[PDB]
Structure formats: structure tokens, C-alpha cells
Amino acid sequence: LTFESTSRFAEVDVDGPLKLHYHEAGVGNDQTVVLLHGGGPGAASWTNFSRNIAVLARHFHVLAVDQPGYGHSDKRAEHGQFNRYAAMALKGLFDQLGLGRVPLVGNSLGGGTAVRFALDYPARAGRLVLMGPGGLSINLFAPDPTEGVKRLSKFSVAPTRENLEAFLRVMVYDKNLITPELVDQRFALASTPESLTATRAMGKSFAGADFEAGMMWREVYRLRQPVLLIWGREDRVNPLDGALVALKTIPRAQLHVFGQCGHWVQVEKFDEFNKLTIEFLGGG
Amino acid sequence: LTFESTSRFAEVDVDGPLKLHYHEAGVGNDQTVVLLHGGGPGAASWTNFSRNIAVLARHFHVLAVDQPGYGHSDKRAEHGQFNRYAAMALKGLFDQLGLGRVPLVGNSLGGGTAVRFALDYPARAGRLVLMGPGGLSINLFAPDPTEGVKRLSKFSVAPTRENLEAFLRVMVYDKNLITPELVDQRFALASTPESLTATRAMGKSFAGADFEAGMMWREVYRLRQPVLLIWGREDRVNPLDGALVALKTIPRAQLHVFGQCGHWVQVEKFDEFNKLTIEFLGGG
Amino acid sequence: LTFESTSRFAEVDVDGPLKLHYHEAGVGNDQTVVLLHGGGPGAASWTNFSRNIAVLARHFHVLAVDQPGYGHSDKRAEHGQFNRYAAMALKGLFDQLGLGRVPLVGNSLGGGTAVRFALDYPARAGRLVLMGPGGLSINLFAPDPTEGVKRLSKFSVAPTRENLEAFLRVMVYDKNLITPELVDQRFALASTPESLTATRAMGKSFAGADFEAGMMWREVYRLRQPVLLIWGREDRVNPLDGALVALKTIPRAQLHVFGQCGHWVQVEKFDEFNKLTIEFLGGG
Amino acid sequence: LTFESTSRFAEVDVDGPLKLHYHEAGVGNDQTVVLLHGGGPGAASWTNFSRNIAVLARHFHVLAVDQPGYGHSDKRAEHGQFNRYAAMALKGLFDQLGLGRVPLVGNSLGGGTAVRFALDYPARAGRLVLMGPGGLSINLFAPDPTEGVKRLSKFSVAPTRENLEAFLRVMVYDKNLITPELVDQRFALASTPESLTATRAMGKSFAGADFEAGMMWREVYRLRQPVLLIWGREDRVNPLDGALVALKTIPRAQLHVFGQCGHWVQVEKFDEFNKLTIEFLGGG
């Protein structure tokens, strides 16, 4: 399984044609699952889930979608509240691919997209696995913006290799995961004018007319499906105190916290993450 | 300054005439403040604030209002979401007394009413002092219903002196405050058939069409005034974990927690509560 | 597998001969695990883990020990801090059975025993699975004693069927688990003079010369092994706020919270509990 | 009331002579209070409390003490656990001035020193006011080291004006308080070779034999006096989650949180902090 063998494109309508890149694997399997990556500079489906896709493709039909603004999906300069926009894109892709009800797996911004989609198209969303998700999280103790969010912002406004590497280092517990290669590739993707325009448009979509769409901690008491919250104890971007309202108000919630783990849960606890996900989503 | 010398009635309009009983003192002072008691069986303005009224009336024009369902105020068999209903009553009283923008002090249910008023009539509410408020509180750790709320429900089903005294015991840290006289004064009001009709009417109001009006932890981010949250560390009705969302999301929040203090803060910590409130509200 | 086929006895020295009852199964397997039940009236190894033992005996050599004061183990009227006493008993049993390093699974009082044993004999304790454990838990929000602890206490002082059934009902989320049969058997065991003497001696062992042995939230930063904290979101005896210091200070900690689950985690989430335990403890 | 008019030295014994510099005012008043500043680079009694000293000296006999390692106090290259060391210095000063039992006000590091003193010399410490205290704080949600503490460490390694100004920025909510004058006054003290030797000596002291002396969240259950914990809601050094164990386990705790306030509470919320402190300490 490679970036190229799994690579696919689809065009959907969100206020016009919109091209979504995604990765597909496990086409023989009967349960489809959708993976949604996080929102940091240079984030994409393959770079964020590359290894998880191989493992999960043994049990499920995996669709790992590059969210609008990211990877090889379109990077419009104008859109509404990012999660609402990304959820409409995904709904376009569900209709095109003929999907019914599908479980969703989302990290950070992708978690928020998964929840916005689950609230807006309740019949189409199955079980949710959310790794340090944005939107449903509300930092009851941490001053906002957090250190990790400030380092994300600083890169958007001063896109240097040094700012990118500062962000990558607060994303993980074990800083030896941040190789000079991984910084080289993320910087190259992240610092293109189109990726920098997309990040600014994403970051400033939260303060707009439909800003309440991002405040999903107000809404998640409406979810009826089982939801697995997964947190790295040492997450500096979306810290653990952000889990509490979702854990309290989602009727069929569970929470798994990993010690010695940051924001990149699916990489830093690769084996334990994949086993939780396969078991919670049934087993394919 | 007695029950009799301070007693007042007003007839206000809430889908028809509604008699409110209240207590008024410090008519000599130019700064008005409204006190709103909690929703415990047999609660009323004088039994819950009698001694606070005397101290506060040195500095302020004090209106302590028996909420609908309580004391000598009308006890309708049917109404909407209680806080919405009680806030509309209060709005009626404000127009009749020609009050402009007035600070509000409120314990538990009357704290929820204060907030519902401050949200629904934003120009009419000043600084808020809220002691273990209901509605804007959401217990992130405490399983609902709490031990305190189960005792409130039990009295509603089996209205005996014993069930009233079990409720009063979990309302306070120092159980010696629960005198046979206080029990006799609460049980006299609590056990009238009008009072018992008002309690069921209230329970029904939280499950009805406008039930979201009760979930003010989703809305307090909209409050523009200074808000003093006051908690007893040992509150068994609305425990301390219920303060966190309001403290995070109210821009001009402050929190004061008293150790060795339960749900009846204005009495358990009389002198400290009176001094905090006088200072926070600007001293007269 | 039955109460009788698995039943075993061993005599150990703790300030004199002490008889411990325990249940043994999976003698063919190579990994031993020790199960330690909770401290509520009538609690025992078979009644608390009966079904889990069958499942876990497929992968491990299960030793489910009746803690001193419980089941068919001795019920002395005098001992030191209960967890220290129970940990010395278990150390006696490890030596007698020729065990080396063994993982431990403990609910509530048994969790505290497992931790006290892991701190006092560090080489003998493997991975720990702790379900709403006592001792390492400190209720940062919940007033102590909790509702569930009060109902435990009330039974010890007024051992009626009605008090026992009140305790059993706050131990679980789904109150239909508390059958008239389960109340009949627990009451019969719990209300014997020897079981009532043991419970009082356990309950009053926490306020004695070695009281600091019970305050294990001060010590768990010394644990070096992986530890799985498991909590029912709706636990009313040892609520979730008690997890936070252990989750923070144990280096290799994880936390799994189950929504719609009380204190009897291993029964109320039988399948999800057994799968977490088998996976965390390796797989046998 | 100036730096010069209030300046004092005492030579005390801590394994040998130790010069402490302090500021004294309100020699007219019979109730003494000691103020202990935080451990930020270039912190001292006058830069951290100058204006508080003037207000407090209307009511109290104020001693504001430059802790060892700071201001004009001795800056030894080696010492034990800092708080233990600083508390022994303070004990020396108490005996020389013939102080009996005196209340203590302390921010961050000086809050830890206040508590270490109150534990180690229980008869000599009165009421404690503690603003974002270190040592008794343990961050149940915030990954350690916090953003604030990493900036303190970074200055220690690369002592530039820029690194000092980055530290000051995360110390306060209103960044306009960080004037070029304050930066110049802190950077003057911070960048001396004695000061930079005192910072490393301090870091080494937290990893040494008596490192537990620093973990006072394990010991504050022993405090018998009233304790006012004061927190800025936006403290990025010692965040609000660090208050919870101390608030739970100090019998006579109170907590006051200010919204729109960081780590420098005595200045960010000058008038409210001065009024709380004067009232809590008994008004003179």
C-alpha cells in the first residue's frame, strides 16, 4: 500500500465544484470507515495515518480524506465555518460513493469535522473515534489559545522551518519522532502560498456569522451513537481538560487516556490506538 | 425589619395575572439589588435571606422576591421552563417598580433565574452574585441526579417531616444549623397542597418544549457583566465541579469557594458572604 | 467452573495464623493474575468476579482472593490499616504459592490493596488494573464521604435489608442488576456478627497510627509498571474526580472511562472490561 | 515610601551566614505580614510588590523579603531544596525581629516557601494568602513543564532581553503591563552572573536528596490555619488546575479566581487583591 496505489479523487458540489483527494484501501472488506486528519501545517491523510491505514485495511474499507485546505484537496481562499464546510464536502463524497451510515475517526480539526457531520447528517454517521478533537473540546483549565495552538498560529503568520519544527515538537511526547526528514516534507507542503492561504482562511472561519457551529461542546448531548474519546495525557494543543464536557454530555461516551502521549495519538501509541479502534468499531 | 414590616405584593402579567410576594428594605438607599432564593421544599425569601436582608439594607435597596411556586407567590399547576417563567415574572416586577439595570443575587434555582433574566433581558440585569447556581452549573464529575437533588425529589413523592429534614441535612455543612424551628417553618410552607402542586409543575417544566432554556451552561458565554460565582466546597446539591464551565466561558467571571460550607452559603458563611457581596456590588 | 471446584484455602502468618479463602482456575496457563474484590457489605471473590473468572481463566491462571474480613477468609476484630494488613496477607499467600511477579486486578478496597502491595513489595507486583479504586483515589470535587460511602456506613451501623439494598442500588447504573436473589444472599453474608465486626474494624482502620498508608494518592508517583485505571462515569461510591491525581502522577498510567456504568465495572461492562484486561495484561 | 527608605538587611544563619535584603513599612502598625515574591528571572520584593507595600502598610507592619537567590539577598552557588532553604532563612529572620506567629503572602515560588515554612515551623506561621503558589500546586491537566515554566528555563540557558520579555509576556493577561522600563529593571537583576548562578543552583535543588520537600500537595492536609488560594484564571505558569488538591485537602481553604488575570495577581488585579488580603488577614 502506497501514497499512489491508494490515491483517489472525487469532485463534489459545495457552492461550486470542489476536488477532494482521499486514500482507499481494504475494498474487499464490508465495513467502511472514514479517517479525518488534524489541522496543523502540512497535515494530510497519508502523512498523518499512513501506517494506521495498512493495519485498519485488514478489517475495514478505509477512506482517508484530505480535508479541504489540506493535502491534494482544493484550497479555496473563502468558505464558511471550517467544520461545517468540511462536513458538507464529506456529505458530497458520501452521496457520490453511495455510502450509508459509516463510522468516523478524526484527530483534532478532523474530530471537529466528524462531530459537525454527525450532528448535521445524524443518519449518515456511525460510531465515532475522536483523538484530541477540536470543536467538542473546551479547555476548562488551560488558557486559550494553548501553547500548541499559538505555535500553529505563529507558523501561519511567520512560515519559517524553525516555527514549523517548534509546532511539531509540542505535538508529540517523544521529540525523536520529529526527524529532519519529517520537518523537510511538512515545511515544503505547509509553506506553499495555497496551503498558507487555506490555513489562514481555516483559522479565521471560527469568528464569522456561523461561529456557533464550532462550539460543538454545546451540542454533543444530541449524539445517540457510541463515541470513543482518545487523549494523550501530555497533549499540549488540545489538553485533556477539553475532554470533560463531551465525556459528561454524550450518553454513550467512553474516554481512553494514554500516559506518555501527545496530540499525535495514532502514531505515538500506534499499536494500542489501532487495537482500540478495531474493537470499538466491531471488528470487520 | 420583620417579615410583616417588609412584606409586599405585586400583580404582574405572565400569560395572565401572577401575584408575587417579596420583601423590601433600605428604601433610604439609591442602589437596588434583587435576591432570589433556592428551589428546596418550603424555600422562600425571608426563611432563606432574612438576616442577609438586614445587613444588605444598610447599603442597598433590597428586594427579596418569593419566586413563583414558592412562599406567598402564586403557585400555578402549569407553566413553561421554570427559569424562563420566573424571569418573565421578575421582568413584570422590574417594569412596575421602574427599575432600570439592577444587580441580582441568587442561590441554586434563583441563580438560574438570575442568569435566565440576564440572558433574556440583557439591559435590565447588572452585576450577578450566584451561589451554587442551578441551570448554568453542569456537574462534570458528579453523577446526576446528585444526592442533594434525589432528596429534593424524594420529598416531592413522600412529603414527610423526615424527608424534609433529610433534604435540609445535605443542604448544609454544619448540621446543627438544621434546628427543629427551621424544619417546622420550612415544613409548614413545603407541605401545603399548592406548594406540592408547584413542585410537580416545576419537574414537568424541565422536560418540556423549551427544556434548553434550563441548560444555561450553553449560553453564559453571552453574559457581558461581572459575575461572582460563590460555592461551598461541601455543596452536595450543586457540587463544586458544576462551576467550571461558567468560570471558563463567562468573560468577567470570578469564583470564590468557601471551605466548611454547603449549599446555603448566605447563612453558613453569613459575614464573609455579606462582605464579598457588598464589595463586589460597589458598596452602595 | 463453580464456587466449589475453584474453592481453595491457605494459612499464612500475619501476627499469627490467618486463613485466606481464594478461587483458582486456568492452572494450565503460564501467566498468573490476582483478582481483589471491593469492600461493600457481603462482597467476596466469587460473587464479585464469578463470571469474569471463567472468561479470564481461558488466558491466565486466576487467583481470586477473599480479602481478610470477607467471604470465607478469617474475620479478625483487630488489625492495622486495612490495605497494609490485606497487602501483608497477600504477600504471605504469594510466598506460600511460590509466585514471582504477578499482575493484580482490584476494584475499590481491592484496588487500594493492590496499590499498597505494589508500593510495599515493588518486585512482586506486575501491571495493575484498578476499577474505581480506594486509597489512590482523592475526590477533588465530591464532598466526602460520598453518597455511596454513606450508604456503606449506614448499613454497618443499621444492618437492615433496606440499607443493604440502598447500597447495592448506588453501586450500579442499571438498577435491574439488583435482583431480590442478589439482595437475599448479600444480606445473609453481610449481616452475620463476624462480617459486621470485620466491616467496622476495616472502616475504623483508616483513622489509626498508620493512617498515611491509606493516602496512596501521595505515593503512586513511585509506581514504575503500567497501570490501567478503569472508571464507570456514573460511579457514586468512588466518583471519577478521584482518578485525576493517579492519572497525572503514575508515569505509565492509562484511564478508561465507561459511560452508563457505575462502581461494579467488571459486571456492568462485563465484555468490554474482560477485553481491556486480557489485552493490557498481554494475552496469556 | 521608596526602595531606599524601606531597604533593610539582616544576616541570618543557614549552614553559615546568609544576608537577606527586605523592605519594611507600617512600623506604626501592630500586626506584621511577610510578602514573598515569585521565582521569575529578576524577581524581587520591590519590583513585584512595591505598590501593594504602600497600600498594605496603611493597615499592617509589612516585611517584603528578597528570597535567597533573588534581589539583593545572598546568591549561593549550592543549597538544598529551595523552599526548605528559603524557609530556614525566613525562620532566622523571624527569630532576629522577635516575630511570633505572622501571616504570609506569597506568589508562585514564594507561595511554596510560605507553605514550607508553615509546615516546618507550624507555630510561627498565621493565615496564608497564596497567589498561584508553586510546590503545593500540581497541574492535573497541564503537561509539565507548562509554557510559562519552559520560558523560565529558556532564559536560564539563553539570558537575552528577548527571552526575558517572552517570560514576562506569559506571566500576565494584559501584555501592556510589560513596559520597556519593567523589562529593563527585571533584566538588570536577571542577567548578573550571581543571579544566573542562583537560577542553576535552584534547578539542581529540585532533583536532589530532599526533592519531596518541594511536593507540598502531599503535605498541605497538615495545615491548621486559614489559607486563601488566589488564582488568575489565565495563569500560564501555574495554571488553575494546580489549585484543586490544595483546595480539597487544606481544611480551612478558600479559593478566589480572577478572570482576566495571569500569574502576577497582586498587580494585574491590584485593588481587588489588596481588599481581599486586608479583609482575610483581619484588617489590621
Sign of CA dihedral C89, C92, C94, C100: positive
Compute the distance between CA of residue A73 and CA of residue A226 in angstroms, rounded to an integer.
30
Compute the distance between CA of residue D33 and CA of residue D126 in angstroms, rounded to an integer.
9
Q: Which of B238, B258, B236 is nearest to B169 (CA)?
A: B236
Compute the distance between CA of residue B258 and CA of residue A123 in angstroms, rounded to an integer.
47
Among left, alpha and beta (phi > 0; psi -120 to 50; other), residue C20 is: beta
3-state secondary structure of A91: helix
3-state secondary structure of D272: helix
Sign of CA dihedral A240, A244, A250, A251: positive
Compute the distance between CA of residue D222 and CA of residue D216 in angstroms, rounded to an integer.
10
Query: Are the C-beta atoms of residues D113 and D83 closer than 8 Å to each other?
Result: yes
Choosing among A141, A144, A170, which should be mutated to test the D contact, i.e. which has the most D CBs within 10 A? A141
Burial of C17 (0-12, 13-18, 19+ CB in 10 A): exposed
Residue D21: partners with Cβ closer than 8 Å, 6 or more residues away = D7, D8, D9, D45, D65, D66, D71, D72, D73
DSSP state string for B161-226: HHHHHHHHHHH-SSGGG--HHHHHHHHHHHTSHHHHHHHHHHHHHTSSTTGGGG-GGGTGGG--S-
**DSSP, res D137:** -
Shortest distance between the Cα of A189 and any Cα of chain C, in A, equals: 34
Compute the distance between CA of residue C35 and CA of residue C86 in angstroms, rounded to an integer.
13
3-state secondary structure of B102: strand
Q: Which of C125, C96, C122 is nearest to C17 (CA)?
A: C96
Other chains touching D, judged by 3 or more CB pairs under 8 Å: A, B, C
Cβ A254–C253 below 8 Å, yes or no?
Answer: no
Compute the distance between CA of residue B171 and CA of residue A80 in angstroms, rounded to an integer.
48
Q: Which of C220, C226, C234, C216 is nearest to C276 (CA)?
A: C226
Query: Are the C-beta atoms of residues A6 and A118 closer than 8 Å to each other?
Result: no
**Within 13 Å of residue D54, how many CA atoms lie on the same side as its CB?**
12
Look up residue B275 and give its amino acid: K
**Within 13 Å of residue D59, how many CA atoms lie on the same side as its CB?**
15
Secondary structure tally for chain C: helices H, strands E: 11, 8
Cβ C257–A255 below 8 Å, yes or no?
Answer: yes
Compute the distance between CA of residue C31 and CA of residue C19 in angstroms, rounded to an integer.
25
Q: Is C255 on the interface with D (CB under 8 A)?
A: no
Among left, alpha and beta (phi > 0; psi -120 to 50; other), residue A283 is: left
Q: After which residues is chain C broken (C to N over 2.5 A)?
A: none
Query: Are the C-beta atoms of residues D66 and D44 closer than 8 Å to each other?
Result: yes
Residue where the block lists cell 477540536: A134
Look up residue B262 and give its amino acid: G
Residue C136: partners with Cβ closer than 8 Å, 6 or more residues away = C111, C112, C115, C130, C216, C217, C220, C245, C246
Shortest distance between the Cα of B57 and any Cα of chain D, in A, equals: 21
Pairing between β-strand B17-25 and β-strand B32-36 as defined by DSSP bridges: unpaired
Shortest distance between the Cα of A181 and any Cα of chain D, in A, equals: 26
What per-residue string of b and e applies to A186-202 under the rule 16 or more CB within 10 Å gives b?
Answer: bbebbbeeebbebbebb
**Backbone φ, ψ for residue D27 (5° rounding):** -60, -25
Compare CB distances from B254 to D253, D256, D275 and report the shortest one's residue. Answer: D256
Give the chain B residue nearest A143 (alpha carbons). B248
Compute the distance between CA of residue C111 and CA of residue C43 in angstroms, rounded to an integer.
14
Compute the distance between CA of residue C109 and CA of residue A215 in angstroms, rounded to an integer.
40
Report the interhelical angle of D161-171 vs D147-157 (nearest 10°). 160
Sign of CA dihedral D16, D21, D27, D32: negative
**DSSP, res C211:** G
Alpha helices in chain C (DSSP H): 3-6, 45-56, 82-97, 109-120, 147-157, 161-170, 180-190, 193-204, 244-249, 265-268, 270-280
Q: Please list every residue in chain A whose beta carbon sits closer than 8 Å to the beta carbon of residue C234.
A: none
Residue where the block lists cell 467571571: B253
CA distances from B236 to A90, A144, A227, D50, D81 (A): 45, 31, 30, 42, 40
Q: After which residues is chain D broken (C to N over 2.5 A)?
A: none
Compare CB distances from B218 to A140, A218, A247 and report the shortest one's residue. Answer: A218
Cβ A248–B139 below 8 Å, yes or no?
Answer: yes
Compare CB distances from D239 to A143, A234, A235 and report the shortest one's residue. Answer: A143
What per-residue string of b and e applies to A23-32 under the rule 16 or more CB within 10 Å gives b?
Answer: bbbbeebebb
Q: Is B264 annotated as a binding residue?
A: yes
Q: Is B208 annotated as a binding residue?
A: no
Choosing among A174, A231, A255, A271, which should be mutated to test the C contact, i.e. which has the most C CBs within 10 A? A255
Q: Which of A140, A144, A84, A80 is nearest to A114 (CA)?
A: A84
Solving technique: X-ray
CA distances from C36 to A34, C48, C90, C156, C239 (A): 41, 9, 10, 21, 19
Choosing among C223, C240, C255, which should be mutated to test the A contact, i.e. which has the most A CBs within 10 A? C255
Residue C64: partners with Cβ closer than 8 Å, 6 or more residues away = C6, C22, C23, C34, C35, C37, C45, C46, C49, C53
Residue where the block lists cell 505494589: C118
Q: Is B245 on the interface with A (CB under 8 A)?
A: yes
Compute the distance between CA of residue C95 and CA of residue D255 in angstroms, rounded to an integer.
49
3-state secondary structure of C13: strand
Residue where the block lists cell 442577609: B52
Q: Is C275 on the interface with A (CB under 8 A)?
A: yes
Cβ C234–B143 below 8 Å, yes or no?
Answer: yes
DSSP state string for C164-209: HHHHHHHT-SSGGGS-HHHHHHHHHHHTSHHHHHHHHHHHHGGGST
Residue where the block lists cell 495515518: A49
Q: Is C39 annotated as a binding residue?
A: yes
Burial of C67 (0-12, 13-18, 19+ CB in 10 A): buried
Compute the distance between CA of residue B115 and CA of residue B71 in angstroms, rounded to an integer.
21
Interface of D with A in 55-114 (CB under 8 A): none
Residue A123: partners with Cβ closer than 8 Å, 6 or more residues away = A101
Cβ A249–B139 below 8 Å, yes or no?
Answer: no
Q: What is the CA radius of gyration of chain B?
A: 17
- Domain range for C154 is 1-284
What per-residue string of b and e applies to B263-273 under the rule 16 or more CB within 10 Å gives b?
Answer: bbbbbbbeebb
Compute the distance between CA of residue D166 and CA of residue D175 in angstroms, rounded to an integer.
10
Look up residue D195 and give its amino acid: S
Compute the distance between CA of residue B21 and CA of residue B73 in angstroms, rounded to an integer.
5
Compute the distance between CA of residue C198 and CA of residue C41 in angstroms, rounded to an integer.
10
Compare CB distances from B143 to C143, C150, C239 and report the shortest one's residue. Answer: C239
Task: Give the dihedral of Cα atoms B204, B206, B207, B209; nearest 10 deg.
Answer: 100
Q: Please list every residue in chain B whose beta carbon sits closer than 8 Å to the beta carbon of residue A242.
A: none
Query: Are the C-beta atoms of residues B195 and B41 closer than 8 Å to each other?
Result: yes
Compare CB distances from A140 to B218, B221, B244 and report the shortest one's residue. Answer: B244
Look up residue A133 and give its amino acid: P
Report the interhelical angle of C147-157 vs C193-204 (nearest 10°). 130
What per-residue string of b and e applies to D202-230 under the rule 16 or more CB within 10 Å gives b?
Answer: beebeeeeeeebbbbbbbbbebebbbbbb
Q: Please list every residue in chain B whose beta carbon sits closer than 8 Å to the beta carbon of residue A215.
A: 221
CA distances from D146 to A253, A261, A270, B246, C280 (A): 29, 16, 26, 24, 30
Strand-pair partners of B106: B36, B130
Residue B167: partners with Cβ closer than 8 Å, 6 or more residues away = B40, B41, B148, B151, B152, B154, B155
Question: Rounded to an integer, what is the distance from CA B192 to the centroid of its chain?
Answer: 21
Q: Is B165 on the interface with C (CB under 8 A)?
A: no
Other chains touching B, judged by 3 or more CB pairs under 8 Å: A, C, D
Compare CB distances from D138 to C139, C215, C248 and report the shortest one's residue. Answer: C248
Other CB atoms within a 10 A radius of the CB of residue A215 amount to: 16
Other CB atoms within a 10 A radius of the CB of residue C84 amount to: 22
Gap between the terminal Cα atoms of chain D: 19
Compute the distance between CA of residue B117 and CA of residue B119 in angstroms, rounded to an integer.
5
Compute the distance between CA of residue B229 and CA of residue B130 in angstroms, rounded to an integer.
5
- What does chain A come to in residues? 284
Q: Is B12 on the interface with C (CB under 8 A)?
A: no
Query: Are the C-beta atoms of residues C252 and C222 closer than 8 Å to each other?
Result: no
Query: Are the C-beta atoms of residues C110 and C39 closer than 8 Å to each other?
Result: yes
Query: Are the C-beta atoms of residues C163 and C151 closer than 8 Å to each other?
Result: yes
CA distances from C162 to C148, C154, C165, C166, C180 (A): 14, 11, 5, 6, 11
Residue where the block lists cell 457581558: B224
Interface of B with A in 110-149 (CB under 8 A): 138-140
Other CB atoms within a 10 A radius of the CB of residue D179 amount to: 10
How many structural domains comprise chain D? 1
Q: Please list every residue in chain A whose beta carbon sits closer than 8 Å to the beta carbon of residue C256.
A: 254-256
Residue A281: partners with Cβ closer than 8 Å, 6 or more residues away = A31, A33, A59, A60, A103, A126, A127, A129
Catalytic residues of C: 263
Query: Are the C-beta atoms of residues D36 and D107 closer than 8 Å to each other?
Result: yes
Query: Are the C-beta atoms of residues D62 and D56 closer than 8 Å to each other?
Result: yes
Q: Which of C68, C56, C71 is nearest to C25 (CA)?
A: C56
State the cell numbers at A186: 511538512
CA distances from C89 to A116, C70, C153, C207 (A): 54, 13, 25, 20
Alpha helices in chain B (DSSP H): 3-6, 45-56, 82-97, 109-120, 147-157, 161-171, 180-190, 193-205, 244-249, 265-268, 270-280
Question: Rounded to an integer, what is the distance from CA D108 to the centroid of its chain?
Answer: 5
Residue A120: partners with Cβ closer than 8 Å, 6 or more residues away = A84, A87, A91
Cβ D259–B247 below 8 Å, yes or no?
Answer: yes
Compare CB distances from A247 to C253, C257, C279 and report the shortest one's residue. Answer: C257
Choosing among D233, D265, D280, which should be mutated to test the B contact, i.e. which has the most B CBs within 10 A? D233
Residue where the block lists cell 500546586: D137
DSSP state string for C35-58: EE---STT--HHHHHHHHHHHHTT
Other CB atoms within a 10 A radius of the CB of residue B148 amount to: 24
Strand-pair partners of C120: none
Strand-pair partners of C11: C19
Question: Rounded to an integer, what is the distance from CA A170 to the centroid of its chain?
Answer: 17
CA distances from A139 to A128, A176, A284, B137, C178 (A): 21, 28, 35, 16, 38
Pairing between β-strand B32-36 and β-strand A102-107 as defined by DSSP bridges: unpaired
Look up residue A267 and give its amino acid: V
Compute the distance between CA of residue D273 and CA of residue D279 in angstroms, rounded to an integer.
10
Look up residue A95 and give its amino acid: D
Output the known binding site of A for substrate.
Answer: 39-40, 48, 107, 109, 186, 264
Compute the distance between CA of residue C53 and CA of residue C64 in angstroms, rounded to an integer.
8
Pairing between β-strand D7-13 and β-strand C7-13 as defined by DSSP bridges: unpaired
Q: Is B212 on the interface with A (CB under 8 A)?
A: no
Annotated catalytic, D263?
A: yes
State the cell numbers at A71: 493535502
Q: Is B268 on the interface with C (CB under 8 A)?
A: no
Q: Which of A148, A111, A125, A128 is nearest to A37 (CA)?
A: A111
Secondary structure tally for chain D: helices H, strands E: 11, 8
Q: Is D231 annotated as a binding residue?
A: no
Query: Are the C-beta atoms of residues B44 and B71 closer than 8 Å to each other?
Result: yes
Give the chain A residue nearest C282 (alpha carbons). A272
Burial of C223 (0-12, 13-18, 19+ CB in 10 A): buried
Compute the distance between CA of residue A262 and CA of residue D56 in angstroms, rounded to an integer.
45
Query: Are the C-beta atoms of residues C263 and C132 closer than 8 Å to each other?
Result: yes
Compute the distance between CA of residue B209 and CA of residue A256 in angstroms, rounded to an integer.
35
Compute the distance between CA of residue C156 and CA of residue C205 in angstroms, rounded to an integer.
14
Residue B115: partners with Cβ closer than 8 Å, 6 or more residues away = B83, B106, B128, B130, B133, B135, B136, B216, B219, B220, B223
- Please name the helix (run of DSSP H) or strand (run of DSSP E) that holds residue D205, with its range, or none: helix D193-205
Sign of CA dihedral C20, C23, C28, C29: negative
Query: Are the C-beta atoms of residues A135 and A128 closer than 8 Å to each other?
Result: no
Cβ C254–A254 below 8 Å, yes or no?
Answer: no
State the cell numbers at C202: 476495616
